[PDB]
Short mmCIF file of C-alpha atoms and ligand atoms in Angstrom, two decimals:
data_model
loop_
_atom_site.label_atom_id
_atom_site.label_comp_id
_atom_site.label_asym_id
_atom_site.label_seq_id
_atom_site.Cartn_x
_atom_site.Cartn_y
_atom_site.Cartn_z
CA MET A 9 0.09 0.06 -0.18
CA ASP A 10 1.07 3.51 -0.91
CA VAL A 11 0.46 5.68 1.62
CA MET A 12 0.93 9.56 0.23
CA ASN A 13 3.17 11.13 2.70
CA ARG A 14 2.97 8.56 4.99
CA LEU A 15 0.24 9.85 6.69
CA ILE A 16 -3.19 8.56 7.24
CA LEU A 17 -5.88 10.46 8.99
CA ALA A 18 -7.78 9.58 11.33
CA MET A 19 -11.67 11.13 10.96
CA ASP A 20 -13.36 10.88 14.35
CA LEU A 21 -14.73 14.24 13.97
CA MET A 22 -18.72 12.84 14.52
CA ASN A 23 -20.38 15.02 12.45
CA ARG A 24 -20.68 14.88 8.24
CA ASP A 25 -20.52 19.07 8.19
CA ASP A 26 -17.34 19.59 9.70
CA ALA A 27 -16.20 15.60 8.98
CA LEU A 28 -16.50 16.15 4.83
CA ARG A 29 -14.92 20.30 5.82
CA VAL A 30 -11.83 19.55 7.39
CA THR A 31 -11.06 16.45 5.47
CA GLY A 32 -11.29 18.99 2.15
CA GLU A 33 -9.14 21.33 3.63
CA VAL A 34 -6.49 18.77 3.83
CA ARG A 35 -7.18 16.87 1.25
CA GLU A 36 -3.60 17.95 -0.63
CA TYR A 37 -1.68 16.22 1.97
CA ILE A 38 -3.56 12.54 1.97
CA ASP A 39 -4.72 10.03 -0.16
CA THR A 40 -5.65 7.96 2.44
CA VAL A 41 -8.17 8.22 5.59
CA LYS A 42 -9.20 5.97 8.53
CA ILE A 43 -13.09 6.23 9.51
CA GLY A 44 -14.36 4.28 12.56
CA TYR A 45 -17.25 4.39 14.46
CA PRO A 46 -17.37 7.85 16.12
CA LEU A 47 -18.30 9.11 12.38
CA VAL A 48 -19.74 5.78 11.35
CA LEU A 49 -22.42 5.25 13.68
CA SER A 50 -22.85 8.56 13.98
CA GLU A 51 -23.31 9.61 9.79
CA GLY A 52 -23.77 6.37 8.11
CA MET A 53 -22.11 3.29 6.31
CA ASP A 54 -23.14 5.43 3.53
CA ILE A 55 -20.24 8.06 4.11
CA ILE A 56 -17.25 5.67 3.03
CA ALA A 57 -18.89 6.04 -0.13
CA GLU A 58 -19.09 10.08 0.19
CA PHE A 59 -15.24 10.59 1.11
CA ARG A 60 -14.61 8.17 -2.32
CA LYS A 61 -17.08 10.15 -4.22
CA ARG A 62 -15.21 13.27 -3.17
CA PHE A 63 -11.79 12.63 -2.25
CA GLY A 64 -10.94 9.65 -4.24
CA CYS A 65 -9.00 8.66 -1.12
CA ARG A 66 -8.35 5.13 0.62
CA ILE A 67 -10.24 4.04 3.42
CA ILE A 68 -9.33 2.14 6.15
CA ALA A 69 -12.12 0.94 8.08
CA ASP A 70 -11.21 1.14 11.83
CA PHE A 71 -13.31 -1.17 12.83
CA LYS A 72 -11.30 -3.46 15.39
CA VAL A 73 -13.19 -6.80 14.51
CA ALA A 74 -13.48 -8.66 18.07
CA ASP A 75 -16.32 -10.74 17.28
CA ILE A 76 -16.74 -14.66 17.46
CA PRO A 77 -15.45 -15.73 13.62
CA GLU A 78 -19.12 -16.44 12.31
CA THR A 79 -19.91 -12.71 13.07
CA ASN A 80 -16.57 -11.58 11.74
CA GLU A 81 -17.15 -13.01 8.18
CA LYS A 82 -20.37 -10.51 8.20
CA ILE A 83 -18.94 -7.90 9.23
CA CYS A 84 -16.04 -7.55 6.92
CA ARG A 85 -18.87 -8.10 4.77
CA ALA A 86 -21.00 -5.34 5.62
CA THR A 87 -18.32 -3.51 5.61
CA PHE A 88 -16.44 -3.62 2.22
CA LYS A 89 -19.91 -4.07 0.49
CA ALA A 90 -19.68 -0.13 1.94
CA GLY A 91 -16.39 0.22 -0.04
CA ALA A 92 -13.86 0.57 2.06
CA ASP A 93 -10.69 -0.99 0.92
CA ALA A 94 -9.12 -2.38 4.60
CA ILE A 95 -10.41 -3.12 8.25
CA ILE A 96 -8.32 -3.19 11.39
CA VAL A 97 -9.47 -6.48 12.99
CA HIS A 98 -7.74 -7.45 16.97
CA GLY A 99 -5.75 -10.01 17.41
CA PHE A 100 -6.75 -10.99 21.05
CA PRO A 101 -9.67 -12.99 19.80
CA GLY A 102 -7.56 -15.73 18.01
CA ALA A 103 -6.28 -17.01 14.69
CA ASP A 104 -9.84 -18.60 14.28
CA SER A 105 -11.56 -14.63 14.58
CA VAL A 106 -8.36 -13.11 12.07
CA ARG A 107 -9.38 -15.50 9.49
CA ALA A 108 -12.82 -15.23 8.94
CA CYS A 109 -11.91 -11.69 8.14
CA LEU A 110 -8.84 -12.21 6.17
CA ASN A 111 -11.13 -15.17 4.40
CA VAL A 112 -13.80 -12.10 3.33
CA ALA A 113 -10.93 -9.57 2.65
CA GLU A 114 -9.93 -11.75 -0.64
CA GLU A 115 -13.20 -12.91 -1.54
CA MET A 116 -13.56 -8.90 -2.22
CA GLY A 117 -10.05 -7.86 -2.77
CA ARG A 118 -9.74 -6.05 0.28
CA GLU A 119 -6.61 -6.39 3.34
CA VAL A 120 -6.79 -6.83 6.67
CA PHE A 121 -5.08 -5.08 9.03
CA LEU A 122 -3.60 -6.52 12.25
CA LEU A 123 -3.64 -5.00 15.44
CA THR A 124 -0.92 -6.34 17.65
CA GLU A 125 -0.61 -3.74 20.69
CA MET A 126 -2.15 -0.80 21.85
CA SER A 127 -1.45 2.65 21.96
CA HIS A 128 -2.99 3.99 24.92
CA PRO A 129 -2.27 3.21 29.03
CA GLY A 130 -4.25 0.31 29.56
CA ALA A 131 -2.73 -1.47 26.40
CA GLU A 132 -0.02 -2.85 29.22
CA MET A 133 -2.82 -4.65 31.42
CA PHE A 134 -4.00 -7.84 29.09
CA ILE A 135 -2.43 -6.73 25.31
CA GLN A 136 0.77 -6.20 25.79
CA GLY A 137 1.92 -9.23 27.26
CA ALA A 138 0.14 -10.77 24.55
CA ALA A 139 1.33 -9.11 21.50
CA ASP A 140 4.41 -10.52 20.52
CA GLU A 141 2.78 -13.80 20.35
CA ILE A 142 -0.67 -12.02 18.27
CA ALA A 143 2.21 -10.85 15.83
CA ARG A 144 3.59 -14.07 15.59
CA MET A 145 -0.07 -15.09 14.76
CA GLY A 146 -0.33 -12.85 11.87
CA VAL A 147 2.99 -14.21 10.47
CA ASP A 148 1.62 -17.69 10.38
CA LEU A 149 -1.27 -16.65 9.05
CA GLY A 150 -0.33 -15.26 5.91
CA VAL A 151 -1.22 -11.42 7.40
CA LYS A 152 0.51 -8.36 5.57
CA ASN A 153 -1.33 -5.46 6.74
CA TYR A 154 -0.27 -4.51 11.19
CA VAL A 155 -1.13 -1.58 13.53
CA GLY A 156 1.11 -1.16 16.72
CA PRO A 157 1.69 1.73 18.68
CA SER A 158 3.82 4.91 18.45
CA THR A 159 3.60 5.40 22.18
CA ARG A 160 5.88 2.65 22.23
CA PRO A 161 8.29 2.74 20.05
CA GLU A 162 10.15 -0.33 21.88
CA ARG A 163 7.44 -2.31 21.20
CA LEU A 164 7.10 -0.65 17.72
CA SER A 165 10.58 -1.68 16.96
CA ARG A 166 9.63 -5.20 17.92
CA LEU A 167 6.61 -5.87 16.15
CA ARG A 168 8.38 -4.51 13.00
CA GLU A 169 11.29 -7.57 13.74
CA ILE A 170 8.59 -9.96 13.98
CA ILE A 171 7.28 -8.86 10.97
CA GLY A 172 10.02 -8.59 8.55
CA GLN A 173 10.31 -5.38 6.27
CA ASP A 174 7.74 -6.71 3.74
CA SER A 175 4.83 -6.59 6.10
CA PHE A 176 2.85 -3.04 5.52
CA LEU A 177 2.83 -1.49 9.25
CA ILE A 178 0.99 1.27 10.43
CA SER A 179 1.09 3.34 13.73
CA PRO A 180 -1.32 5.53 15.83
CA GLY A 181 -1.15 7.56 18.51
CA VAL A 182 0.97 10.61 16.74
CA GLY A 183 0.49 13.72 18.48
CA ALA A 184 -2.25 13.86 21.28
CA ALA A 185 -1.23 10.58 22.95
CA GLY A 186 2.41 11.80 22.82
CA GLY A 187 3.64 9.77 19.87
CA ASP A 188 6.47 11.80 17.91
CA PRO A 189 6.11 11.54 13.96
CA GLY A 190 9.80 10.97 12.64
CA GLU A 191 10.70 8.11 15.56
CA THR A 192 7.34 6.81 14.76
CA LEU A 193 8.61 6.61 10.95
CA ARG A 194 11.50 4.55 12.05
CA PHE A 195 9.17 1.87 12.03
CA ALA A 196 6.29 2.23 10.88
CA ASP A 197 5.33 2.87 7.08
CA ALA A 198 2.64 5.05 7.71
CA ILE A 199 1.71 7.44 10.68
CA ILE A 200 -1.82 7.76 11.62
CA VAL A 201 -3.11 11.18 13.48
CA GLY A 202 -6.23 12.27 14.50
CA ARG A 203 -6.85 14.81 17.13
CA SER A 204 -3.92 16.95 16.44
CA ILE A 205 -4.76 17.60 13.34
CA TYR A 206 -8.68 17.65 13.57
CA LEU A 207 -9.51 19.20 16.51
CA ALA A 208 -6.03 21.97 15.59
CA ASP A 209 -7.43 25.75 15.07
CA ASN A 210 -5.89 25.04 11.58
CA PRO A 211 -6.60 21.66 10.53
CA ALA A 212 -4.26 22.27 7.26
CA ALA A 213 -1.56 24.30 9.22
CA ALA A 214 -1.23 21.12 11.74
CA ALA A 215 -1.26 18.76 8.64
CA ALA A 216 1.37 20.51 6.95
CA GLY A 217 3.62 20.95 10.12
CA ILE A 218 3.94 17.41 10.77
CA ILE A 219 5.16 16.96 7.40
CA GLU A 220 7.61 19.58 7.19
CA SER A 221 8.75 17.93 10.24
CA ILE A 222 9.66 14.74 8.49
CA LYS A 223 10.61 16.03 5.15
CA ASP A 224 13.47 14.06 4.66
CA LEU A 225 11.88 10.65 5.40
CA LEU A 226 9.60 11.38 2.28
CA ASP B 7 -32.10 -4.56 40.85
CA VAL B 8 -31.46 -5.60 37.06
CA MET B 9 -33.52 -6.03 33.48
CA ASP B 10 -36.33 -8.13 33.55
CA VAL B 11 -35.50 -10.54 31.45
CA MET B 12 -38.59 -12.20 29.66
CA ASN B 13 -38.63 -15.74 29.49
CA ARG B 14 -34.56 -15.87 30.59
CA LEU B 15 -33.96 -15.47 26.89
CA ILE B 16 -32.23 -12.55 24.17
CA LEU B 17 -32.94 -12.67 20.50
CA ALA B 18 -29.18 -12.28 19.01
CA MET B 19 -30.64 -10.85 15.91
CA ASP B 20 -28.22 -10.82 13.05
CA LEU B 21 -29.79 -11.07 9.96
CA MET B 22 -28.44 -8.44 7.42
CA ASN B 23 -31.47 -6.98 5.88
CA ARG B 24 -34.02 -5.13 7.63
CA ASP B 25 -37.22 -7.23 5.79
CA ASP B 26 -35.97 -10.49 7.32
CA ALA B 27 -34.56 -9.14 10.86
CA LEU B 28 -37.79 -7.61 11.51
CA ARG B 29 -40.27 -10.24 10.41
CA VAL B 30 -38.12 -13.04 12.22
CA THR B 31 -38.02 -10.10 15.39
CA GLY B 32 -41.87 -9.72 15.23
CA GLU B 33 -42.21 -13.63 14.96
CA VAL B 34 -40.74 -14.29 18.56
CA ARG B 35 -42.40 -11.67 19.93
CA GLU B 36 -44.66 -12.64 22.22
CA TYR B 37 -41.62 -14.72 24.21
CA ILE B 38 -39.32 -12.35 24.35
CA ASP B 39 -38.65 -8.56 25.23
CA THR B 40 -34.82 -8.36 25.23
CA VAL B 41 -32.71 -8.11 21.61
CA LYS B 42 -29.21 -8.02 21.08
CA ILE B 43 -28.42 -6.23 17.87
CA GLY B 44 -24.99 -6.21 16.53
CA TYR B 45 -22.68 -4.73 13.95
CA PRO B 46 -23.93 -6.91 11.40
CA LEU B 47 -27.05 -5.64 11.31
CA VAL B 48 -26.27 -2.12 11.93
CA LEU B 49 -23.68 -1.93 9.16
CA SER B 50 -26.17 -3.53 6.62
CA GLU B 51 -28.86 -1.10 8.07
CA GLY B 52 -27.97 1.90 9.73
CA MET B 53 -28.28 2.77 13.61
CA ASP B 54 -31.58 3.63 12.74
CA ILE B 55 -32.52 0.49 13.07
CA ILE B 56 -32.50 0.41 16.65
CA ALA B 57 -35.31 3.32 15.91
CA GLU B 58 -37.32 0.87 14.09
CA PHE B 59 -36.99 -1.74 16.56
CA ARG B 60 -38.30 0.61 19.28
CA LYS B 61 -41.21 1.08 17.23
CA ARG B 62 -42.05 -1.85 16.18
CA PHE B 63 -41.48 -4.15 19.61
CA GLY B 64 -41.79 -3.73 23.02
CA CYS B 65 -37.91 -4.52 23.24
CA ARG B 66 -34.95 -3.72 25.12
CA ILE B 67 -32.15 -3.00 22.90
CA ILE B 68 -28.27 -4.32 23.76
CA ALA B 69 -26.12 -3.19 21.28
CA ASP B 70 -23.53 -5.45 20.79
CA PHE B 71 -20.57 -4.10 19.55
CA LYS B 72 -17.84 -5.50 21.52
CA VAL B 73 -16.32 -1.98 22.36
CA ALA B 74 -12.67 -1.72 21.53
CA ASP B 75 -10.82 1.16 21.01
CA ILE B 76 -8.76 4.01 23.52
CA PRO B 77 -11.10 5.64 25.84
CA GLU B 78 -11.65 8.39 24.02
CA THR B 79 -12.73 6.57 21.15
CA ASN B 80 -14.82 4.08 23.21
CA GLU B 81 -16.13 7.32 24.68
CA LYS B 82 -17.41 8.55 21.66
CA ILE B 83 -18.53 5.20 20.27
CA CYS B 84 -20.66 5.17 23.89
CA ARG B 85 -22.46 8.40 23.08
CA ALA B 86 -23.39 7.64 19.77
CA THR B 87 -24.41 4.31 20.64
CA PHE B 88 -27.05 5.47 23.19
CA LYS B 89 -28.32 8.70 21.52
CA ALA B 90 -29.54 5.96 19.22
CA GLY B 91 -31.52 4.90 21.62
CA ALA B 92 -29.04 1.44 22.68
CA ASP B 93 -29.94 0.40 26.60
CA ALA B 94 -27.45 -1.55 26.57
CA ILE B 95 -23.79 -1.14 25.11
CA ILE B 96 -21.30 -4.63 25.36
CA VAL B 97 -17.47 -3.63 26.43
CA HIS B 98 -14.15 -5.94 26.01
CA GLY B 99 -12.42 -6.05 29.32
CA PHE B 100 -9.42 -7.21 27.49
CA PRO B 101 -8.01 -3.68 26.24
CA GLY B 102 -7.66 -2.75 29.82
CA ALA B 103 -9.07 -0.91 33.29
CA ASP B 104 -9.18 2.62 31.65
CA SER B 105 -11.11 1.47 28.24
CA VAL B 106 -13.86 0.15 30.35
CA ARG B 107 -14.16 3.05 32.79
CA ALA B 108 -14.51 5.80 29.69
CA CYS B 109 -17.18 3.67 28.61
CA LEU B 110 -18.94 3.13 32.57
CA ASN B 111 -18.47 7.04 32.62
CA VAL B 112 -20.83 7.44 29.56
CA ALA B 113 -22.89 5.34 30.61
CA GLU B 114 -23.55 7.03 33.90
CA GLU B 115 -23.52 10.15 32.53
CA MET B 116 -26.65 9.36 29.66
CA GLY B 117 -28.38 6.82 32.25
CA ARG B 118 -27.47 3.74 30.07
CA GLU B 119 -25.75 0.52 31.06
CA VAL B 120 -22.25 -1.49 30.27
CA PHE B 121 -22.53 -4.96 30.00
CA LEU B 122 -18.12 -6.41 30.13
CA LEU B 123 -17.17 -9.11 27.65
CA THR B 124 -15.18 -11.42 30.05
CA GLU B 125 -14.23 -14.57 28.16
CA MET B 126 -15.98 -15.67 24.69
CA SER B 127 -17.35 -19.06 23.69
CA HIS B 128 -15.52 -19.58 20.45
CA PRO B 129 -12.42 -21.56 20.28
CA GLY B 130 -9.68 -18.87 19.43
CA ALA B 131 -11.04 -17.20 23.02
CA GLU B 132 -8.84 -20.10 24.06
CA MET B 133 -5.68 -18.73 22.56
CA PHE B 134 -5.66 -15.48 24.51
CA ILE B 135 -8.69 -14.25 26.69
CA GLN B 136 -9.14 -17.28 28.46
CA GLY B 137 -5.77 -16.51 30.42
CA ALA B 138 -6.80 -13.15 30.81
CA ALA B 139 -10.26 -14.11 31.82
CA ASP B 140 -10.64 -14.40 35.15
CA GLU B 141 -8.39 -10.69 36.04
CA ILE B 142 -10.36 -9.06 33.11
CA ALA B 143 -13.82 -10.50 35.46
CA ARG B 144 -11.61 -8.93 38.73
CA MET B 145 -11.30 -5.98 36.98
CA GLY B 146 -15.20 -5.44 36.15
CA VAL B 147 -15.95 -5.79 39.53
CA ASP B 148 -13.21 -3.55 41.22
CA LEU B 149 -14.76 -0.47 38.84
CA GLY B 150 -18.57 -1.01 39.66
CA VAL B 151 -19.10 -3.16 36.71
CA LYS B 152 -22.48 -5.15 37.75
CA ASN B 153 -23.25 -6.90 33.87
CA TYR B 154 -21.29 -9.70 32.39
CA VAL B 155 -20.96 -11.95 29.37
CA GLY B 156 -19.31 -15.27 29.00
CA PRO B 157 -19.97 -18.25 27.44
CA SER B 158 -22.12 -21.11 27.52
CA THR B 159 -19.84 -22.88 25.90
CA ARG B 160 -17.57 -23.99 28.32
CA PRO B 161 -19.79 -24.65 31.87
CA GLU B 162 -16.54 -25.00 33.60
CA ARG B 163 -15.27 -21.06 33.09
CA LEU B 164 -19.04 -20.06 32.85
CA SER B 165 -19.27 -21.48 37.09
CA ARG B 166 -16.29 -19.25 37.65
CA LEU B 167 -17.01 -16.07 36.42
CA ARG B 168 -20.22 -16.19 38.10
CA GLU B 169 -18.30 -16.84 41.05
CA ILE B 170 -15.61 -14.06 40.43
CA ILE B 171 -18.48 -11.56 39.45
CA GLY B 172 -21.05 -13.09 42.77
CA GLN B 173 -24.78 -13.56 42.81
CA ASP B 174 -25.62 -9.95 43.07
CA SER B 175 -24.25 -9.18 39.38
CA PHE B 176 -26.33 -9.82 35.98
CA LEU B 177 -24.62 -12.49 33.83
CA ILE B 178 -25.77 -12.94 30.31
CA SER B 179 -24.44 -16.00 27.75
CA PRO B 180 -24.29 -16.64 23.71
CA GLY B 181 -22.75 -19.71 22.23
CA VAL B 182 -26.90 -21.57 22.90
CA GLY B 183 -27.94 -23.77 20.17
CA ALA B 184 -25.50 -23.40 16.93
CA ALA B 185 -22.67 -23.26 18.83
CA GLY B 186 -23.10 -26.15 21.23
CA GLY B 187 -24.23 -24.51 24.76
CA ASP B 188 -27.50 -26.35 26.56
CA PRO B 189 -29.98 -23.37 27.62
CA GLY B 190 -30.70 -25.16 30.92
CA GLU B 191 -27.33 -26.18 31.91
CA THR B 192 -25.65 -22.25 30.81
CA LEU B 193 -28.84 -21.03 33.54
CA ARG B 194 -27.37 -23.01 36.25
CA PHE B 195 -25.16 -19.87 36.01
CA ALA B 196 -26.20 -17.07 33.60
CA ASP B 197 -29.36 -15.74 34.62
CA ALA B 198 -30.03 -15.29 30.88
CA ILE B 199 -29.35 -17.39 27.30
CA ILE B 200 -28.47 -15.52 24.02
CA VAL B 201 -29.30 -17.31 21.38
CA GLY B 202 -29.43 -16.39 17.86
CA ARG B 203 -29.00 -19.12 14.65
CA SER B 204 -31.46 -21.68 16.43
CA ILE B 205 -34.21 -18.93 16.07
CA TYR B 206 -33.15 -16.75 13.60
CA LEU B 207 -32.53 -19.19 11.04
CA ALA B 208 -35.26 -21.69 11.94
CA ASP B 209 -37.68 -22.06 9.43
CA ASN B 210 -40.36 -21.31 12.25
CA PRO B 211 -38.30 -19.02 14.31
CA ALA B 212 -41.97 -18.89 17.11
CA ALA B 213 -41.75 -22.66 17.36
CA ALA B 214 -37.99 -22.94 17.81
CA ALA B 215 -38.03 -20.06 20.57
CA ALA B 216 -41.51 -21.96 22.12
CA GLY B 217 -38.82 -25.28 22.28
CA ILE B 218 -35.65 -23.76 23.70
CA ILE B 219 -38.34 -22.04 26.23
CA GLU B 220 -40.22 -25.22 27.04
CA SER B 221 -36.80 -26.92 27.90
CA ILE B 222 -36.26 -24.42 30.78
CA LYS B 223 -39.79 -24.09 31.85
CA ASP B 224 -39.19 -25.16 35.47
CA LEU B 225 -36.26 -22.80 35.44
CA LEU B 226 -38.73 -19.72 34.94
O1 LIG C 1 -3.61 1.03 19.59
C1 LIG C 1 -4.67 2.23 19.10
C2 LIG C 1 -4.85 1.67 17.81
C3 LIG C 1 -5.93 2.81 17.13
O2 LIG C 1 -6.62 1.97 16.32
N1 LIG C 1 -6.04 3.49 17.84
C4 LIG C 1 -7.02 4.80 16.58
O3 LIG C 1 -6.30 5.89 15.84
C5 LIG C 1 -6.95 6.99 16.31
C6 LIG C 1 -5.72 8.11 16.45
O4 LIG C 1 -6.15 9.23 16.91
P1 LIG C 1 -5.52 10.40 17.37
O5 LIG C 1 -4.45 11.03 17.03
O6 LIG C 1 -6.59 11.18 17.92
O7 LIG C 1 -4.55 9.99 18.87
C7 LIG C 1 -8.29 7.13 17.05
O8 LIG C 1 -9.47 6.58 15.57
C8 LIG C 1 -7.81 5.46 17.71
O9 LIG C 1 -9.45 4.86 17.80
C9 LIG C 1 -5.46 4.35 18.83
O10 LIG C 1 -5.27 5.73 19.15
N2 LIG C 1 -4.67 3.46 19.31
O1 LIG C 2 -18.14 -14.55 23.26
C1 LIG C 2 -19.17 -14.72 22.86
C2 LIG C 2 -19.60 -13.34 22.51
C3 LIG C 2 -20.91 -12.91 22.17
O2 LIG C 2 -21.37 -11.78 22.09
N1 LIG C 2 -21.38 -13.15 21.13
C4 LIG C 2 -22.64 -13.40 19.98
O3 LIG C 2 -23.54 -13.99 20.16
C5 LIG C 2 -24.32 -14.53 19.55
C6 LIG C 2 -24.18 -15.38 19.33
O4 LIG C 2 -25.50 -16.26 17.98
P1 LIG C 2 -25.68 -17.84 18.02
O5 LIG C 2 -26.92 -18.18 19.13
O6 LIG C 2 -25.88 -17.02 16.26
O7 LIG C 2 -23.87 -18.61 17.65
C7 LIG C 2 -23.71 -13.73 18.26
O8 LIG C 2 -24.73 -12.63 18.05
C8 LIG C 2 -22.50 -13.27 18.54
O9 LIG C 2 -21.86 -12.39 17.52
C9 LIG C 2 -21.08 -14.91 21.09
O10 LIG C 2 -21.13 -15.85 20.12
N2 LIG C 2 -19.83 -15.40 21.75
#
């Protein structure tokens, strides 16, 4: 996957007018948008097609898929029917649940991103201790796309070690949560950035500023 | 003081089109007053499907969204879900205490309820969730969680989770029917059973629900 400026916008605004306006303001800097449940549950799954119509961007559905295999299959089918290019799936619920997602993605020409370790403080309680094994499980399953935490660069580096240089790795927790753009890009192919852009007084300048700070990495 | 689930039976409405979902739910309405609506239906028909269910049926709505994000995103998901009319939302515990607390705080503010999913019922649950489940449940108790989800497919695990949360907590349990869990055995520990495919894929969903209820008649 080829992400413009190695920057993915996490569009977690919850109303259509603001979400479309802010995305429009930063469109020159990105071609990939992560859309999650905050926006989808507020405005409907049709918002995905609207983003494609307006911006032609790729859409990653950040749905943290975390159900039984049968339900995971249904969630992936509904999500890809809505036009998402990719979906984010938790690894914690185990291999069968991930495989269910991989199957639908293959069937519909999409990608699965496996979330291995999360970026927030609570991730330390249960997820972190399982994360390397979850990543090895991804490798065993043939997963090629991964998500890991900007907030713990040593953990992000370990994830990169496990999956190898050929796999694709994206990383949230940049900006608001404390992660540094440049350091994160030592290991991740692309950074995910939400609040630092969409809550900024001037989202375009915020995006431009981040990109300037990583100019030599592009 | 817990929700009063008619016949101790919660329908898992995982059909993905409005017409079928509405037909089947209507067909079993005399047997249930509590419906679990998840992402298969919501991502297919929109959050307004909750509105349509409330209009059509006298049913409480549990939004089975297995919320599993960072605290800030969890808060937004819970707000949107309660705004749409869900009575309760199901949240994963494995992302940790801050993520669960975020959901509890919104539920308290908005006058609604959180269910904490501890151990899951499918085979893959053995890989990572099972080993964390007793602690996830204990964490829930420490956080003041009153409502829980645990697996009918592993009676020994469901029994242990009931012990951890205590007799006063409310416990609901999926994996009944299609996945092999027995209604009666499950109700030894759970307050209510969740049933999806055994009912919604039946040629006669009403007969299927009645049959399940007949099999647990002495437990009502
Ligand atoms: O470990 C993770 C995984 C995520 O998907 N995310 C998601 O990435 C985004 C981060 O946004 P922000 O830059 O505002 O912190 C949010 O949409 C969040 O749900 C995360 O923060 N940490
Ligand atoms: O551990 C769990 C937790 C669940 O919420 N579920 C949910 O409960 C329902 C079970 O439906 P069924 O009776 O068709 O197996 C599904 O909606 C599923 O997503 C589960 O099966 N196992």
